[PDB]
């Protein structure tokens, strides 16, 4: 679940996750918070593992 830029596209967050983490992604579900912060649910592919990358970034 990424807090993204407010002008992010759902076609950005596809290509701004691969470019940052070497990841293929499946389906992105983007909502704006009532703080007015855009929040994006990136569901990865099957062959990747979300917990595997979460330690790799630092979301422990």
């Amino acid at each position: 679940v990424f807090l993204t830029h407010l002008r992010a596209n759902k076609n950005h967050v596809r290509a701004a996750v691969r470019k940052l983490y070497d990841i293929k992604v499946a389906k992105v579900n983007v909502l704006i918070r009532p703080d007015g912060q855009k929040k994006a649910y990136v569901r990865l592919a099957r062959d990747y593992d979300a917990l595997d990358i979460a330690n790799k970034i630092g979301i422990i």
Partner: protein, 123 residues
């Protein structure tokens, strides 16, 4: 870490600069996550430092772009708008200082005949 100065950055090339830049944004993403995660060092307070550190890379990388665009636009009429000396709008529209001083042949003939003399009408 040792503070990156524009006095140092101006010798580096535009090839190095973005490579020097990329390791600061890639450093900055690792500190944003370090803020929300409860950065266990009291602060990795780089996000004051490494944020303005990028800002002095983008300035030098844009000055070198902007000075290099001026010499490719010398001895060309029609410089681009943003290379054309902003001063105001009011003095931009008004009669370039040569052109105010154009002199009709009556005006440059009655000038040269009678010079204004330098006298002293004194008793």
């Amino acid at each position: 870490m040792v503070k990156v100065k524009c006095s140092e950055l101006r010798i580096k090339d535009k090839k190095e600069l973005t490579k020097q830049l990329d390791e600061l944004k890639n450093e900055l993403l690792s500190l944003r996550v370090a803020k929300v995660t409860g950065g266990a060092p009291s602060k990795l307070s780089k996000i004051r430092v490494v944020r303005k550190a990028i800002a002095r890379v983008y300035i030098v990388m844009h000055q070198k772009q902007k000075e290099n665009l001026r010499k490719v636009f010398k001895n060309k009429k029609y410089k681009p708008l943003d290379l054309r000396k902003k001063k105001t709008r009011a003095i931009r529209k008004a009669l370039s200082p040569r052109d105010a001083n154009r002199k009709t042949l009556k005006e440059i003939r009655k000038r040269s005949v009678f010079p204004q003399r330098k006298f002293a009408v004194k008793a």
